[PDB]
A and B are shown apart, each in its own frame.
Chain A
C-alpha cells in the first residue's frame, strides 16, 4: 500500500475533537504529534514549570510537542 508506517502518529483525545481550536491556549500534552493541519498556530507547551511559547511552522510537522519546550535549564559552571 501507499502507507510506509502502519501505525498512526499519536495525538491525545482532546485534540481529536476540536482540533486547532485547542491550539490557541496552554498545552500540557508533550506526547502528542504535530500534525500537518496544525501549521500557522501558536501553542504554549508545558515544560514542567511554565508554558513555553511555540509557533508551529512547516518544519515542526512530525515532531512531538515536547521537543520545542525544554525541561532542564542549560547550565553553566562558575
Chain B
C-alpha cells in the first residue's frame, strides 16, 4: 500500500493556486468561443432526442 507515494507540491498552496489558475484560464478560453462542456443532462444527442 506504500507503492504510490505522496507528492510534496501539495504542501504549497501557491503551486496549487497556479495550477488551478491555469485550468480556469483554459476553461474561460473555451467558454468565450462557446466550445466548453455542455450542460449535464442536456447533451447534443440528448438535445436531438428531445427535439
Contact present between A and B (CB < 8 A): no
Which residues from chain A sit less than 8 Å from chain B, CB to CB? none
Which residues from chain B sit less than 8 Å from chain A, CB to CB? none
